[PDB]
């Protein structure tokens, strides 16, 4: 099974699932730590920005991949926003300074 533009969810714009509608896998934590062993920093960068939920990122990425620009725009994780709300949902004022 394979898919290059799979369903980023409505909730977390997370992958559709596993081949379920051309869905895909979920990476492995021991492996990701190993990846840190690589210090494969750009690999991590795309894996969480290119290879995360980013509508604003997957869009520019596909645009450049067509365009042969060869760049990724991380921005900021949205699961971060969700958790930050869950904190503000809990009894926590949650914010980030500059």
């Amino acid at each position: 099974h394979a898919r290059s533009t799979g369903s980023y969810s409505l909730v977390t714009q997370q992958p559709l699932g596993g081949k379920a509608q051309f869905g895909g896998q979920r990476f492995g934590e021991m492996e990701v730590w190993a990846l840190e062993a690589y210090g494969a920093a750009y690999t991590l960068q795309e894996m969480l920005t290119v290879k995360s939920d980013d509508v604003n990122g997957r869009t520019k990425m596909y645009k450049n991949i067509v365009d042969g620009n060869h760049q990724m725009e991380p921005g900021m994780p949205e699961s971060f926003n969700v958790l930050l709300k869950e904190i503000r949902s809990l009894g926590i004022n949650i914010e980030l300074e500059d």
């Binding site: 210090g39 920093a41 991380p74 994780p77």
Partner: protein, 220 residues
């Protein structure tokens, strides 16, 4: 025991158990309560001298750390570990063992504040940084007597700097409360912090990325 080392006996019946105190005068004799449960190791004369000797029972971790010290304690630890490794047939580099220790024994325990702080439980390294920055610079006299305390894993995880990190470790409900009541700040210094954040982990080449970034941030 390391106070006043001539074999003694007595306090067979007290608030404690049999042969509770068998210290000597020595120099600054101390009251060592000895249960003397299974057996003892009392000798006739010059039974011991300065330092600590095993009278009875298997050793304890804080025992070696506090009395024996570290590099010897590190030796004891590495021995007890590579032993099983060989009994297994593993091929394990010991620089690993030293690293594991370097994680393990932090937050040295302090009797003297030394103008730094009158408490217990401070990063022995933070203690060292402070000691260099104050004793050398202005007040060498500000001497904080600190006892390098070895720490075990199951908690020393909680000894983490970025409240982003350690949050999930096993749980955080208390830890979230604690971050809050602390007014605590993640500071995004760490690798897991950068990861869930997704920032230039000072890791791999990102070491240099965060390096130039920190060069800018000192400038601002």
């Amino acid at each position: 025991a390391e106070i006043s080392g001539i074999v003694s006996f007595g306090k067979e019946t007290k608030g404690k158990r049999r042969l509770v105190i068998t210290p000597v005068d020595g120099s600054d004799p101390y009251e060592e309560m000895i249960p003397k449960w299974r057996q003892l190791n009392v000798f006739e004369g010059e039974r011991v001298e300065r330092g600590d000797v095993i009278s009875d029972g298997p050793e304890a971790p804080h025992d070696i750390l506090r009395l024996r010290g570290v590099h010897a304690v590190t030796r004891y630890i590495v021995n007890e570990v590579q032993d099983v490794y060989r009994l297994q047939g593993v091929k394990i580099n010991d620089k690993h063992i030293e690293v594991i220790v370097r994680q393990m024994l932090r937050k040295a325990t302090i009797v003297n504040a030394g103008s730094s702080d009158f408490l217990e439980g401070e990063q022995v390294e933070y203690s060292r940084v402070k000691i260099a920055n104050r004793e050398l610079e202005a007040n060498g006299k500000v001497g904080a007597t600190y006892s390098r305390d070895l720490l075990g894993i199951t908690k020393a995880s909680l000894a983490t700097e970025s409240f982003i990190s350690a949050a999930s470790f096993q749980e955080t409900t208390r830890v979230l409360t604690e971050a809050a009541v602390a007014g605590k700040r993640d500071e995004l210094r760490g690798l897991k912090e950068n990861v869930i954040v997704g920032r230039l982990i000072p890791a791999g080449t990102g070491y240099a990325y965060h390096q130039d970034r920190m060069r800018r941030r000192a400038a601002g």
